[PDB]
């Protein structure tokens, strides 16, 4: 019953700084079908056993999705640090859920759709867990104000991925967050 298809099988994914969230409620999910899928390079769960997922019920499941580099997939995990974890998409230390990643070079790179995926490069502070920042204000690195323009010691905050791997290649990522204060296994 759970519409994971719209999430995993969308033709374009979100940029990581503007990561997508879908709320999954009032349905049945067969997690083992996903876990056993040969398509995924990464399928790592935290706070729950991957096999026991079909036995559990949760209040809601949130599916967050985006594209990053293969060598950034390690940052989508509890307790990690780096450009992605700090400034784009942050998991909490006590994360309960699964992180699924697969190579999307043929869809997302210049040999495929040649999509424009971006990331945030500068930020005043690290993101809180599951916080999202889609602002495009000029970032002030020095003491002098930017006044809305990329002048002296001022920087546009986003940059497009090049993808030029596999560490350099685009990976699509789906994070499943399991909220229990509706969505069960078969």
């Amino acid at each position, epitope marked *: 019953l759970c519409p994971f298809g719209e999430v995993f099988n969308a033709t374009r994914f979100a940029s990581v700084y503007a990561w997508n969230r879908k709320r999954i409620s009032n349905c049945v999910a067969d997690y083992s079908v996903l876990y056993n899928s040969a398509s995924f390079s990464t399928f790592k769960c935290y706070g729950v056993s991957p096999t026991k997922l079909n036995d559990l019920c949760f209040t809601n499941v949130y599916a967050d999705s985006f594209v990053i580099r293969g060598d950034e997939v390690r940052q989508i995990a509890p307790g990690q*640090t780096g450009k992605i974890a*700090d400034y784009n998409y942050k998991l909490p230390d006590d994360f309960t859920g699964c992180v699924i990643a697969w190579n999307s070079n043929n869809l997302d790179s210049k040999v495929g759709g040649n999509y424009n995926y971006l990331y945030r490069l500068f930020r005043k502070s690290n993101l809180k867990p599951f916080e999202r920042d889609i602002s495009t204000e000029i970032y002030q690195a020095g*003491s002098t104000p930017c006044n809305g323009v990329e002048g002296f010691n001022c920087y546009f905050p986003l940059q497009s991925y090049g993808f030029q791997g596999v560490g350099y290649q685009p990976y699509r990522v789906v994070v499943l967050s399991f909220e229990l204060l509706t969505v069960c296994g078969p």
Partner: nanobody
Amino acid sequence: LQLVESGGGWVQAGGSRRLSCAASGFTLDSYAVGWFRQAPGKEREWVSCSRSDGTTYQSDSMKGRFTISRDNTKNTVYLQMNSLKAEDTAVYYCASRRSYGCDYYGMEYWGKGTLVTVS
């Protein structure tokens, strides 16, 4: 918990000098490290940043004369200063924070500084 600058001293104008920032009490693998400077009577100025992945960005003011670099093995961050002029005279400070990049207002740890005087 500690940043210690060294390598300061007297330089002749046009010359070079390399400052070092040694971090102890943590590995800077997850920390941004920045160099700042304060000239007498002036506001503190940002000089450059070495991100936690080794990439860098630096102040337009320096006209590409300084380059920052890091060596996580020695847990040290360097500032290579070239073509020094008299207005580069200042106390140079190393600073860090647990973040990918630096920030002028949000640095979390500071060294005591080291003086660089250009003739």
